[PDB]
């Protein structure tokens, strides 16, 4: 395959914001949507690999991240804004459809993209976060609070400023510890006013899949932006719930290949594995192919199991 | 076949209590009224369609009549409104419905068709055609630029102001319902054959209870709706549609609308649009003013399905 230097970088105005797009290759578009707290850069291995197989790999920094515009208001980060961006981006590519690959928050954008404009998506490779049907009886954050308590990370992510302070008080080290984390189960912070267990321990050494140059690149971007843009996605969960009422009991009709590590925080959170194995996932996503569970892999599977992920993507999309 | 034979009930949909009026048995024909109307605006179609073997269902929309009116302006975005109607359809226990709508109800209807087309067999749309999202400019910003600050929708924006202005609510409704003036309704600052004082009194009784705030709140979300519906820029409606308008309708006579229809642009965005029906000498409230013809127009279309 190629080098990082052969990847093209550019800016496009989409849905009223300037978006950074990285891309390489010619052929059918494969569009990659990163998660939190990541960047287009999280897809580096897949960009090289898929372009080498005759596809046009496209990976933007999402709204609020990296070199993409970060609107000042929290309310500009609802699911409607996010999918709007990606729809505008797809239309800017001059193609009728794309193959879609996404991870974490990017996969949530990807699910609603598949619901809102399915004709734009030929097939979807979804990493980490499966479809989550809307629960009209309770708001999502409320439910998390009732199930995991006030210290569940997403609950603590809600108040403006706090999670930012909790982390940054060295963004390189903060990104590194987030990326190298392998603790399964729901992330439950200590009570407010108590130190994160992290700060008492030395920074853990890098795993094989993540280099210092990688950590340096991540840090260069987040040193400028901070985490606010990314955190604002979580801050719109309850509003998103109001805004998506029309998709209660909706089904995704795009073909999907779902892939997760078995140590993924998401997979090992209450309900998710049961949701998958009970057949509920398949009910909601009738053209879901056989689910892939990656032995001994944690949350950041596009990076940790980069080669296997590039392979799984190609083997799926070449079918269409 | 008698107003009193029409069933009334309350159903919990999308977190609000919704008053629902219905008659007949058979395939559902769901009716969505506009501003400043009620379930009552479909009275003649309800009787007519039930008399033809369909189950006619007509709610008061969010903010109207006997339906709950949430207090927060932000509870009236297009996402809430379609949310309500999707939940309503789900509560009926049938798979698909025939949809008929008018004015703001037609706008709800259009986005319903975009959001959940699988729930709509066919759509009979009155007065308001599909409007493709304009990414260059927000809708109220565009109205102010085109028509200035006294354009009615611009005046509706500031909370309380229109309410105070319209503050005898039945006379107010009477003047809106009988209006036939042409062109951009700009604000300052006898009854037609088809409308009776009886009808006026019903409307006046409900709006004396509710006020106009609920319905005006739909307009106060036009700009936010625009921000929230960017994912549907260039989207196409995949439901069969019959569009019907009176030729004196302010929408039909407004800038670019007749062109949108005649150029074939409407047909481009709604590829299964049938023959547009233009009713001569009919103004905005074509469901009431041409009750019989509208009823027959609905019957003849939905029987094809």
CATH number at residue B159: 3.40.50.1820
A145-154 long-range contacts (CB < 8 A, ≥24 apart) are A147/A270, A148/A186, A148/A188, A149/A188, A151/A188, A151/A189, A151/A190, A151/A191, A151/A192, A152/A186, A152/A187, A152/A188, A152/A189, A153/A186, A153/A187, A153/A188, A153/A189, A154/A234, A154/A237
Instruction: Find the CB nearest A248 among B80, B86, B229.
Output: B86
Q: In angstroms, rounded to a whole number, what is the distance separating the alpha carbons of residues B141 and B158?
A: 14
Q: Are strands B97-102 and B55-59 parallel, antiparallel or unpaired?
A: unpaired
Q: Hey, of A79, A246, A252, which one would you mutate to test binding to chain B, going by the most B CBs within 10 A of its CB?
A: A246
Angle between helices A306-317 and A44-51 (to 10 degrees): 40
Using the Cβ of B91 and the Cβ atoms of chain A, whether some distance falls under 8 Å is answered with: no
Q: Omega before B36 cis (within 30°)?
A: yes
For A253, name the nearest residue in chain B, comparing CA atoms only.
B118
Q: Say which residue the tokens 């959170």 belong to.
A: A269
Backbone angles phi, psi at A122, to 5 degrees: -75, -45
CA angle A145-A148-A150, nearest 5°? 50
Supply the residues of A annotated as catalytic: 104, 234, 299
d(CA B53, CA B164): 45
Residues of B in contact with A80 (CB under 8 A): 79, 227-231
Give residue A27's region: left, alpha or beta (phi > 0; psi -120 to 50).
Answer: left
Single out the residue of B176, B182, B196 nearest to residue B291, CA to CA: B196
Resolution (A): 2.0
Report the number of distinct structural domains present in chain A.
1
Nearest CA in chain A to B83: A246
DSSP chain A: ---GGGSEEEEEEETTEEEEEEEE-SSSEEEEE--TT--GGGGHHHHHHHHTTT-EEEEEPPTTSTTS---SSGGGGSHHHHHHHHHHHHHHTT-S-EEEEEETHHHHHHHHHHHH-GGGEEEEEEES-------TTS-HHHHHHHHH-TTBHHHHTSSTTHHHHHHH--HHHHHHHHHH----S--BPPPTTS--GGGGSPPPPPPTT--HHHHHHHHHHHHHH-SHHHHHHHTTHHHHHHHTGGGTT----S-EEEEEETT-TTTTSTTHHHHHHTTHHHHHSTTB---EEETT--S-HHHHTHHHHHHHHHHHHTT-
Count CB atoms within 10 A of the CB of residue A39.
Answer: 27
Per the structure, the complete domain to which residue B301 belongs is given by 1-305
Chain A residues inside the 8 Å CB shell of B115:
116, 246-247
Say which DSSP state B60 is in.
P
From A213's Cα to the closest Cα of chain B, the distance in A is 36
Q: Which of residues 140-179 of B touch A (CB under 8 A)?
A: none
Q: Kindly determine whether residue B90 and residue A250, on different chains, have CB atoms separated by under 8 Å.
A: no
In this structure, are residues A134 and A142 in contact, taking their beta carbons and an 8 Å threshold?
Answer: no
Question: Coil, helix or strand for B125?
Answer: strand
Q: Catalytic residues of B, which ones? A: 103, 219, 284
Chain A residue with CA closest to B80: the answer is A243
Give me the total of CB pairs closer than 8 Å, taking one residue from chain A and one from chain B: 74
Shortest alpha-carbon distance between residue B87 and chain A (Å): 8
A113 touches chain B (CB under 8 A): yes
CB proximity A205 to B under 8 Å:
no
Please state how this structure was obtained.
X-ray
A246–B112: do the CB atoms touch at under 8 Å? yes
**Residues from chain A contacting residue B119 (CB–CB below 8 Å):** none
- Distance in angstroms (rounded) separating the CA atoms of residues B62 and B221: 14
């Amino acid at each position: 395959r190629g080098s990082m230097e052969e990847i093209e970088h550019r800016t496009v105005e989409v849905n009223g914001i300037k978006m950074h797009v990285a891309e390489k290759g010619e052929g059918p578009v494969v569009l990659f949507l990163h998660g939190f707290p990541e960047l287009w850069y999280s897809w580096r291995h897949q960009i090289l690999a898929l372009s080498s197989r005759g596809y046009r790999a496209v990976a933007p920094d999402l709204r609020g991240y990296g070199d993409t515009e970060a609107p000042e208001s929290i309310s500009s980060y609802t699911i409607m804004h996010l999918v709007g961006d990606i729809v505008a981006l797809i239309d800017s590519l001059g193609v009728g459809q794309v193959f879609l690959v996404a991870h974490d928050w990017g996969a949530i954008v990807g699910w609603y993209l598949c619901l809102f404009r399915p004709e734009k998506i030929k097939a979807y490779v979804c990493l980490s976060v499966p479809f989550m049907p809307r629960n009209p009886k309770v708001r999502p954050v409320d439910a998390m609070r009732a199930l995991y308590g006030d210290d569940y990370y997403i609950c603590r992510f809600q108040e403006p400023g706090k999670a930012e302070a909790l982390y940054g008080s060295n963004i390189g080290e903060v990104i590194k510890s987030i990326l190298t984390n392998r603790r399964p189960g729901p992330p439950i912070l200590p009570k407010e006013g108590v130190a994160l267990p992290s700060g008492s321990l030395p920074s853990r050494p890098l795993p094989s899949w993540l280099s210092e140059e990688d950590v340096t690149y991540y840090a260069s971007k987040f040193s400028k932006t901070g985490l606010t843009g990314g955190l604002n996605y979580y801050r719109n969960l309850n509003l998103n719930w109001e805004l998506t009422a029309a998709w209660t009991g909706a089904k995704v009709k795009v073909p999907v290949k779902f892939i997760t590590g078995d140590l993924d925080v998401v997979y090992t959170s209450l309900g998710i594995k049961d949701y998958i194995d009970s057949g509920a996932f398949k009910r909601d996503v009738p053209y879901l192919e056989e689910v892939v569970v990656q032995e001994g892999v944690a949350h950041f599977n596009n990076q940790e199991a980069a080669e296997d992920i590039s392979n799984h993507i190609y083997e799926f999309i070449k079918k269409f």
